[PDB]
Design an enzyme around this catalytic site. Structure first.
Site, mmCIF file in Angstrom:
data_model
loop_
_atom_site.group_PDB
_atom_site.id
_atom_site.type_symbol
_atom_site.label_atom_id
_atom_site.label_comp_id
_atom_site.label_asym_id
_atom_site.label_seq_id
_atom_site.Cartn_x
_atom_site.Cartn_y
_atom_site.Cartn_z
ATOM 1 C CE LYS A 33 -3.752 2.159 2.655
ATOM 2 N NZ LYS A 33 -4.568 2.350 1.432
ATOM 3 C CG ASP A 123 -13.367 2.806 7.605
ATOM 4 O OD1 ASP A 123 -14.628 2.885 7.674
ATOM 5 O OD2 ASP A 123 -12.743 2.888 6.537
ATOM 6 C CD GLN A 127 -15.267 -1.948 0.391
ATOM 7 O OE1 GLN A 127 -16.027 -1.192 1.013
ATOM 8 N NE2 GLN A 127 -14.499 -1.533 -0.628
HETATM 9 N N1 LIG Z 1 -3.295 -7.652 3.028
HETATM 10 C C1 LIG Z 1 -4.236 -7.431 2.046
HETATM 11 N N2 LIG Z 1 -4.519 -8.410 1.104
HETATM 12 C C2 LIG Z 1 -5.451 -8.032 0.247
HETATM 13 N N3 LIG Z 1 -5.931 -8.816 -0.757
HETATM 14 C C3 LIG Z 1 -6.958 -8.570 -1.734
HETATM 15 C C4 LIG Z 1 -8.355 -8.814 -1.055
HETATM 16 C C5 LIG Z 1 -9.515 -8.580 -2.052
HETATM 17 C C6 LIG Z 1 -9.339 -9.438 -3.343
HETATM 18 C C7 LIG Z 1 -7.942 -9.223 -3.996
HETATM 19 C C8 LIG Z 1 -6.804 -9.498 -2.972
HETATM 20 S S1 LIG Z 1 -6.059 -6.422 0.516
HETATM 21 C C9 LIG Z 1 -4.964 -6.292 1.894
HETATM 22 C C10 LIG Z 1 -4.908 -5.066 2.736
HETATM 23 O O1 LIG Z 1 -4.010 -4.970 3.600
HETATM 24 C C11 LIG Z 1 -5.925 -3.973 2.564
HETATM 25 C C12 LIG Z 1 -7.340 -4.225 2.414
HETATM 26 C C13 LIG Z 1 -8.251 -3.137 2.254
HETATM 27 C C14 LIG Z 1 -7.715 -1.809 2.255
HETATM 28 N N4 LIG Z 1 -6.374 -1.549 2.403
HETATM 29 C C15 LIG Z 1 -5.498 -2.603 2.553
#
Ligand SMILES: Nc1nc(NC2CCCCC2)sc1C(=O)c1cccnc1
Length: 294
Positions: A33, A123, A127
């Site tokens: 991120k 939050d 999602q």
């Molecule tokens: N670790 C992690 N893995 C994700 N995989 C994604 C999950 C949805 C489908 C595609 C792979 S999203 C996520 C986050 O840390 C995260 C989640 C929401 C907002 N900001 C950060």
């Protein structure tokens, strides 16, 4: 970055963008991120370094924090699905109750841990709840509402979901307590059960009024101090409370009882994560595996 190959965009937050990426070196697949600035306030840079030590099986692990070139990159362990997509995928049949119970139980453990370490999520939404093939569910995307203050929104602008926001936040209480996360989780629990958002507000006032229409407009009896809240107006309409039997059918009484305690108007009366874990609803909790199509 230069040490990560971006596989694809995992999400576009209002404050940052998330990528699935591979560590060109460790060969590890992670969620990267990048955060939005002059040099990003150090006040949070130390607050972030704290979350790095916040490790629990139901909290998405923050592997690395990289501050560079006005950008801040957060490297998280990668999970393949989030609860929002999982609920959409299970809309026809609904998530089986044992899985709903397992997920709620694990999320409460995650929160009890965060909360016992004086860390609030702020939050929670489907999602931001990640799941894997082993039946685990984890809290992700914590603090992003305590770093860049209160900016406009995002580049091309994206609509923030208010559906899981506690009433004290909507009424202008400046000091959130651990109770706002319990409220959000209660909304999510209801949603897994009915397969419909509990309070789908499309504006702050519509959000607040949807809550009032279902739970009754709060007063000093159920919520001491509510009429002194910053954004409270004596002019709010007065709606009667609806029966939970009508709100989350066909949830059993144990579930409806726990839900009502997670949804108490008074933040001080709202059940804590720790106490919720002891609720009779979890007497027969188990850890089923979800049917995940990746
Ligand atoms: N670790 C992690 N893995 C994700 N995989 C994604 C999950 C949805 C489908 C595609 C792979 S999203 C996520 C986050 O840390 C995260 C989640 C929401 C907002 N900001 C950060």
């Amino acid at each position: 970055m230069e040490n990560f190959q971006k596989v694809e965009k995992i999400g576009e937050g209002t404050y940052g963008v998330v990528y699935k990426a591979r560590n060109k070196l460790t060969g590890e697949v992670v969620a990267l991120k990048k955060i939005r600035t002059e040099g990003v306030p150090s006040t949070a840079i130390r607050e972030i370094s704290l979350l790095k030590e916040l490790n629990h099986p139901n909290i998405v692990k923050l592997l690395d924090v990289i501050h560079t070139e006005n950008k801040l990159y957060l490297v998280f362990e990668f999970l393949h699905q989030d609860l929002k997509k999982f609920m959409d995928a299970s809309a026809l049949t609904g998530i089986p109750l044992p899985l709903i119970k397992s997920y709620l139980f694990q999320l409460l453990q995650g929160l009890a841990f965060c909360h016992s370490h004086r860390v609030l999520h702020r939050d929670l939404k489907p999602q931001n709840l990640l799941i894997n093939t082993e039946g685990a569910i984890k809290l992700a995307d914590f603090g992003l509402a305590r770093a860049f203050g209160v900016p406009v929104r995002t580049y091309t602008h994206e609509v923030v979901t208010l559906w899981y926001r506690a009433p004290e936040i909507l009424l202008g209480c400046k000091y959130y307590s651990t109770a706002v996360d319990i409220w959000s989780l209660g909304c999510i629990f209801a949603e897994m059960v009915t397969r419909r958002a509990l309070f789908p507000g499309d504006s702050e006032i519509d959000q607040l009024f949807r809550i009032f229409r279902t739970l009754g407009t709060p007063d000093e009896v159920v919520w001491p101090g509510v009429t002194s809240m910053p954004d409270y107006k004596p002019s709010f309409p007065k709606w009667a409370r609806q029966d939970f039997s009508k709100v989350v059918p066909p949830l059993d009484e144990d579930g409806r009882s726990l839900l009502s305690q997670m949804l108490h108007y008074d933040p001080n009366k709202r059940i804590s994560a720790k106490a919720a874990l002891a609720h009779p609803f979890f007497q027969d909790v188990t850890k089923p595996v979800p049917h995940l199509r990746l």
